[PDB]
Design a protein around this nucleic acid. Sequence first.
RNA 1: AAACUCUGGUGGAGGUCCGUAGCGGUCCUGACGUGCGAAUCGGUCGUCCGACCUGGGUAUAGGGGCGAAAGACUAAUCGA
RNA 2: AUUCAAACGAGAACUUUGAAGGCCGAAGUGGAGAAGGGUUCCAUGUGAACAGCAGUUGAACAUGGGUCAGUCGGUCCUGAGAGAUGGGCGAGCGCCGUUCCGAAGGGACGGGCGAUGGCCUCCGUUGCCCUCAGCCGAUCGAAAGGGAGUCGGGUUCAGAUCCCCGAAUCCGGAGUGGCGGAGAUGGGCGCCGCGAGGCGUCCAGUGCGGUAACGCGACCGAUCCCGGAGAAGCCGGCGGGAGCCCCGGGGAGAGUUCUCUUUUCUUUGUGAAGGGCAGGGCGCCCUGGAAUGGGUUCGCCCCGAGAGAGGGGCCCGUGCCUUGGAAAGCGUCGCGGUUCCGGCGGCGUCCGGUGAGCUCUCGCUGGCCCUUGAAAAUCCGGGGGAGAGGGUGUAAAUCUCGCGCCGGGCCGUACCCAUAUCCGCAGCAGGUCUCCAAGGUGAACAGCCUCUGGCAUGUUGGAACAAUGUAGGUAAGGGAAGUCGGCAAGCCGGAUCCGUAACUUCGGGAUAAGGAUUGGCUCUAAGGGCUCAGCCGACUUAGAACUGGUGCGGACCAGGGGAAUCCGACUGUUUAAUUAAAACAAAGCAUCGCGAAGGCCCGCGGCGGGUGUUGACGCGAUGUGAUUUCUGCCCAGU
Lengths: 69, 57, 120, 91, 149
Amino acid sequence: PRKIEEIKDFLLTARRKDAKSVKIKKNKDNVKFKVRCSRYLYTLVITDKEKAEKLKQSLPPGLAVKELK
Amino acid sequence: VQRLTYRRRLSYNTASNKTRLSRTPGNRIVYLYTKKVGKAPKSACGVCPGRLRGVRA
Amino acid sequence: RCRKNTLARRKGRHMGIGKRKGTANARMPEKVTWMRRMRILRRLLRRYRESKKIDRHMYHSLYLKVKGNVFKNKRILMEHIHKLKADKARKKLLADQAEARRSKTKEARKRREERLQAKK
Amino acid sequence: AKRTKKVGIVGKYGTRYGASLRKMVKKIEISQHAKYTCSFCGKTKMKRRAVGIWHCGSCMKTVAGGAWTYNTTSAVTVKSAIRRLKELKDQ
Amino acid sequence: PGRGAPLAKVVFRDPYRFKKRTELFIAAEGIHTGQFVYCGKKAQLNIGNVLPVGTMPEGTIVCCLEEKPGDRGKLARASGNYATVISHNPETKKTRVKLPSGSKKVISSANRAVVGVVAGGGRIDKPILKAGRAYHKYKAKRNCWPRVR
RNA sequence: AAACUCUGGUGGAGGUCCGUAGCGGUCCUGACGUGCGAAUCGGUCGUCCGACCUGGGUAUAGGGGCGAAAGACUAAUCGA
RNA sequence: AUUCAAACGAGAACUUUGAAGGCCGAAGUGGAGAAGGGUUCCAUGUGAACAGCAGUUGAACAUGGGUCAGUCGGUCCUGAGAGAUGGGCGAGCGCCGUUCCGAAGGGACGGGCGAUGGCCUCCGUUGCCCUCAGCCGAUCGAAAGGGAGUCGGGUUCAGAUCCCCGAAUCCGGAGUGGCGGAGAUGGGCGCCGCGAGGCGUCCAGUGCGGUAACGCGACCGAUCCCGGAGAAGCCGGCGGGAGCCCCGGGGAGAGUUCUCUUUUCUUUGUGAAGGGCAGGGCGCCCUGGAAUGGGUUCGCCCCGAGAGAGGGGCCCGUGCCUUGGAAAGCGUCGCGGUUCCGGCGGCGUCCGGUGAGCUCUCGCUGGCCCUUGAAAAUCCGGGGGAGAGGGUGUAAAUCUCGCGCCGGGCCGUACCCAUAUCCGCAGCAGGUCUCCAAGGUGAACAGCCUCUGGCAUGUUGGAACAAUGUAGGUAAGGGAAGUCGGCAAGCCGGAUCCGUAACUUCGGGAUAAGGAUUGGCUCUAAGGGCUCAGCCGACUUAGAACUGGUGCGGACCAGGGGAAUCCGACUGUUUAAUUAAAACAAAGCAUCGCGAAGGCCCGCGGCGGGUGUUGACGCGAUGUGAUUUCUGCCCAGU
């Protein structure tokens, strides 16, 4: 696993060709954005609540989204 | 207390059979076969007793 | 029931002579007793040198007397320091009031020759 | 305090091996464990590693010496003898 | 192991190839690491210098002596032993040396030896005290020790 | 006076001692003696940091091997 | 060490379930392996035979089932050794020998020539010539040594680091290299534009930072050369980190509740691989210059060859946090699928403190040796600088940086692993290599009791309680009178405080001998951390009072002593299965041979072999047997 901290490289990895799926783990106090690539599972944990759905729609539509719970 | 066993077929306490305990997410202790500890390079001067710096052991 | 007995051992019950099977050194190794004592006393001296209560020269000589098994515990050492701080402070007062008596007559003498070089 | 009367290092052998053998090993066993002053660095660190081999724990310099002593008397007379024939041949 | 005299890894510079040849001499007492050892006919006469016997003066204390020219040393190489160059003979190129046994021998002048006595002398003076010490001594050499008469 | 000597600690040597596991096998001349067993069992014992104990690998073969030596051992077989 | 009831069944002392009473008691009657066994594993069925009574049961019998791997081993490496070829020997099968009497390399770089394939571009392929080479002894030899890289959860009647799910990782490969990034893009000049900039020429560029230790994501380079890692004994002490145990709380569920107990019990988590931080370690650097010497350890040890004191650097971080990761696991409460269900929900998975504690591990530091405690595969660094690449650009050669793509074959894998799966003719009290290890008492991995787990008393039951046994005990008065003989049994026993002789190699003897004390309870005193005072924290010693039918190491555990003789100094070893000794060994002592074409010895043979990877402080052959004190006379005989 690899923890992505800053926000803009996440969507840079999300648009890779080997990025198979993204998952939304919405637990309390965090919303993690797990994106499964070929070698790693990159994670983008953001503490903000509304900025999550600021990006949840920003994903490329080709990649399969998955609300995880 | 939970007594635990080996996980390979080597049942002797040889130097290639060293272990360490580990608590798994399943709430159980298991063995984890460790790697032998490395050593950093010794100086080519052949007289300094220490080992080199800046290189991984 | 075990908890009820260890609570009594804390008060010293069931630990008389007739309930001890191992030698005194086996129950309490004298090496670790000496270890506890050294680490304690050396640490005490290391705080006193740190807080300027004692100097290097007193620390070093007092260090070896700890190693020499002179002081039995922390209180006996701490009071022995007080007597060393006291007596040298007397000697510090006695050797400065006597030096003040000496250096005063030094220039009080020089003032006297100062009247000789001016009149001649 | 002085723990023994006349049995030094060889007190470890207890009552074994007889008095004379325990006495003539004392002079040797004191020597083979003594630390000598390294003639190269000056520090008292020359200590016997193995029989005949003497290592200085400070300058890390190894010296071929006697078995139980640092210098064999037979060797020091030979070093001084060679030193005379050396300057006598070349003049 | 199994030898009283210590050895000495001496590193030379091969004169024909770019290489460093290493040897195992028998350390002469007084040798120390980082010391320069000189070998050959023009080598000076100091402790730990192998040079042909014919070049040495009389009464020179040598060790690791060659019994035949070029056999890499055979004589006087136990701990603390040595041989003395008794006398030369310019013609016929021969030299008399006495051996640690007391026998005097006429060897060729060409064969060489390292100057000085063998390190590790005086080993036989310390008494083996225990049967155990004797067991460990021979366990490093060969199966010969417990000797039923 | 010196040489050094006393006293208290520290230290942790040793084919060191008591003693467990282990390895042994002293005595009862105990049990058993068509046995549990073609050599075992009980109590009592020896040793237990070393000439220690042990698995596997490997070497030595019959007038040969191997033997801290008892003609011991060499597949329940050994003066062949 | 069994008992009651029930179920199944023709049939129950023996099977199964439930209850009760017990045992193993973490050095196990527990949980897993190696060797060996070879289907004994698992399910269903049967009750002939077999399981020394029985059997509704079985490791029996009859049907069927069952072992899944790039990551765990084998495979690879070498060890002691084994063993071909050359050679030698040999009537001969063959033997010796393993670098020795040998033309022992079939490889590589570059260059030159010819040739081909794909956009015969450029590269690959091939032949020839030239140039270079130390290789060095074929090959075999370890399921415990060396050896890159897999972990978590789930799943079966029986298999899981192998299947499923989810997270990784190592190695190998890639004309057109699949993509980025690095290499890399600067300066001088002459003009234009007010400038902001942009042109046309010339030149540089195989990275960069830090006083340094060294750092940064990469950061050209061959033959050759040097080095490192692999790669190291035993023992002691101490320190760090875990796991376990313990203590004080908080939840969840259970047990007790005649009385008491805010109680007793159970349970209360996070993998590999990354990132960060603690925490350990450093003979790492810089400043500076120390006696009135200082620093410092349990011990040590360190210092003008640079101490203290400051400020840095590196290594390991198995601990914590984090990504993984709460989705999963577990604990409870509840709702479903009437069920088939990795069903679906609810909360919870908490906060602290201790330790000469135990085990594991990491590290530091000593001790011991006439003992110095493996090799190789494999991998890496450095020194060198033969060469290679592009001319200011869509830069080239080249990259041990990031990501992407492809592949990882072959064989083992079930179970037993031992008072019933092995060997002893057998379900044989024998034998057979290891790993994990709870609570109480206690010095303790002792013995005794208990929890987790396991079991049915060891190839039968019932009824009696005679003699003889076997194994345990107890005995008035006497106390070895018994007997070859104190054989056997008994006494003694722990600890604390006293006290301790002859003799002695001065070390011992020695727990010598001989005394006293020991319970329960209630107290007092002393021994530490953290911020004078306050707040935390543990165990331990000494003393006092009271008290019991003088009993208190109350079980368990646990030395009879003395004084003399003989032998052997000691420790050690020995007749497996009648002899453990005074025998053997032993250190010590003393002889003897031998300077290598040699001594001793092997061998049918050989330029054979062992000692010998040796050299008189050595090797070989004998006697005696530590120390102490001595060792006399005889060379006629042999």
